[PDB]
Amino acid sequence: KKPGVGTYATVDKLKAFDVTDGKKDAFTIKDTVRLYNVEEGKTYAIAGQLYEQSVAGDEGSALAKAATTVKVTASMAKPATEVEKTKYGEDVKVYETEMDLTVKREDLTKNQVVKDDIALVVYEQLWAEGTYEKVNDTEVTPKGKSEPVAKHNDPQSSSQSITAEPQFGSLKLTKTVTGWEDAFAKVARPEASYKFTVKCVQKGSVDEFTLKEGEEKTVEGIPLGDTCTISEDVQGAVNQAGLKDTVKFTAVNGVTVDSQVNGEAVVKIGGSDTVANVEVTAENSFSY
C-alpha cells in the first residue's frame, strides 16, 4: 500500500477572498491535508506551495510555501469518503492535519489595481521518515536523491483552488447649473444637454454620456485604486446657454477632485477609510 496525500484549500471558511481589502497586508490559506495509508507512529514531512494557476509547479513562481513534520497519531484519524475509497481502496486509512500558507497582498496585486479574479492553487508533497534531512518553515531537503512518496500537484484541482477576488468602485456624476438666463440661451433650460467623457485610466475604459441639469449617471466596475478623468464639452454648454461657463467640480465624503483646466477633473476611486463609490458634481456656472 502506497501512501497518498490530498488537500483542500479555504480562506476564512470560503473558496474566495477579497484581494482588494486594503485593511489586510496578507491572507492565510488554510491547507487541510489528508494523509492516506500512512502509518501511526511514523514521522512524515509535508510541504505545501501556493501558486497562481497558470504558473503552477514552476520553481521560482510560488507565492507562499510551508513545510513541517507530522508524527501520525490515532487522534488525527478521519472517516474516509466514498471518493477516497474509490481512489485508494475500500480499506484506506485516513488522517488529517493542517498547514497555513500565507501570501502578502502586494505579491498578488504588485501594487497595481486588480482588474479580474486571480486563480490560485495549492500543491502538496509527502515525504516518508528518513528520506529528508532538513525541514524548515518553507521546504524539505532530501536525503540523497530521495523524492516524496506522494504528491498532489494538480493545477486544475477544485479542492485546492482559491480565488483572489477583486471588488470594484464607481463614479457617479451629477450636473448642476447656476447663472442660466433665457435672454442669452439657444435652448430651453430643461432641454440643455451637457456632454461628458469619463475615462478610467488603468482599466482603459471610456464612458461617453449626456446629462441634463440635475441628471446623474454612474460609471460602474472601476478597479479600486484607479483614477478617473472627467471632461465636459464646455463650448457645447456655452453654445446652449449663450454664456461663458466656469465649471466647478466638487465631491462628497471628503474625496479630492482636482481641476487644472476648465471642464477637466481628475478623481481617485477607492482611495484610513476608502471611498469606493465616489460622487462628483459638475456645476456649470454661467455668466456674461
Gap between the Cα atoms of 217 and 207, Å rounded: 10
**What count of Cα atoms within 13 Å lies in the side-chain half-sphere of residue 185?**
15
Q: How many CB atoms lie within 10 A of CB 245?
A: 23
Q: For 202-215, give one letter per residue: b (16+ CB within 10 A) or e.
A: bbeeebeeebebee
For 22-72, the DSSP string reads TT-SEEEEEEEEEEES--TT-EEEEEEEEEEGGGTT-TT--SEEEEEEEE-
| Breaks in the chain listed by the residue before each, with C–N > 2.5 Å | 271
Gap between the Cα atoms of 220 and 206, Å rounded: 12
Q: Are strands 277-287 and 168-178 parallel, antiparallel or unpaired?
A: parallel
Q: Are strands 64-71 and 257-258 parallel, antiparallel or unpaired?
A: unpaired
Residue with cell 523524492: 147
Residue with cell 442669452: 184
Q: Measured in whole angstroms, how far is the alpha carbon of residue 44 from the centre of its chain?
A: 35
Q: What is the resolution of this structure in A?
A: 1.5
